[PDB]
Every structure is written in structure tokens, then in C-alpha cells.
């Protein structure tokens, strides 16, 4: 509360540190149905179903121009693209099956680095 704070937490590094882990995820081999926006006129349904596009490209683009507060806000866009992917591909397709895979990836990285 006011004038009372809990201990200050190093965030000096997370800048870098989602960034490592921004290039970990651009370069897994799984990465592809990720590393672009989907292209809303060519992919019918996903404009009006999938309310908050959001791909690897985008997210490196945010990272690098100062538009995530925290380091909380860099991982909600991570899981918005598995989300996202979850909404519109089946589980059995290798979409769906690349985005559980990446999701994964993620999730452990993050737990390693920051947990």
C-alpha cells in the first residue's frame, strides 16, 4: 500500500530474456503455422471467429518497440497464439498437434528462466 512495499524482484534482464526465448520458439521446427499473421483474406472463418490474431512476427515486433509493460503481458501474447490455435485447429491435424508441442516448449522455458 501506500509508502509500504514488498522487496524489489531484478527485472532488469527480462527485456533479453523473452527475447532468447522469442528466438528459441521462432526456430523449433514447429514453429511455422506461428511465425506469421494467418492471412485473413485467404483463410476463410478466422477473421470473424478468432477475435485476437496473434503470431510469433507480431510479438517480436511489440517486444522490440517497447509495447510490453511487464513481462506478463509478453506471456499472455505467447498463449493467445496456442489459444488462438486450440480455437480453430482439431487436436489430430499437425497444426493442432504443433501448437500443444509449442505450447509446451514454452511453458517449461518460461518456468526455467523466470520460476
Given at each position: ?78 498463449r493467445l497464439v496456442f489459444d488462438n490455435c486450440e480455437t480453430f485447429n482439431e487436436d489430430?491435424s499437425?497444426i493442432g498437434?504443433?501448437g500443444h508441442?509449442?505450447r ?12
Amino acid at each position: 500500500s501506500m509508502s509500504v512495499k514488498k522487496p524489489k524482484r531484478d527485472d532488469s534482464k527480462d527485456l533479453a530474456l523473452c527475447s532468447m526465448i522469442l528466438t528459441e520458439m521462432e526456430t523449433h521446427e514447429d514453429a511455422w503455422p506461428f511465425l506469421l499473421p494467418v492471412n485473413l483474406k485467404l483463410v476463410p472463418g478466422y477473421k470473424k471467429v478468432i477475435k485476437k490474431p496473434m503470431d510469433f512476427s507480431t510479438i517480436r515486433e511489440k517486444l522490440s518497440s517497447g509495447q510490453y509493460p511487464n513481462l506478463e503481458t509478453f506471456a499472455l501474447d505467447v498463449r493467445l497464439v496456442f489459444d488462438n490455435c486450440e480455437t480453430f485447429n482439431e487436436d489430430d491435424s499437425d497444426i493442432g498437434r504443433a501448437g500443444h508441442n509449442m505450447r509446451k516448449y514454452f511453458e517449461k522455458k518460461w518456468t526455467d528462466t523466470f520460476k
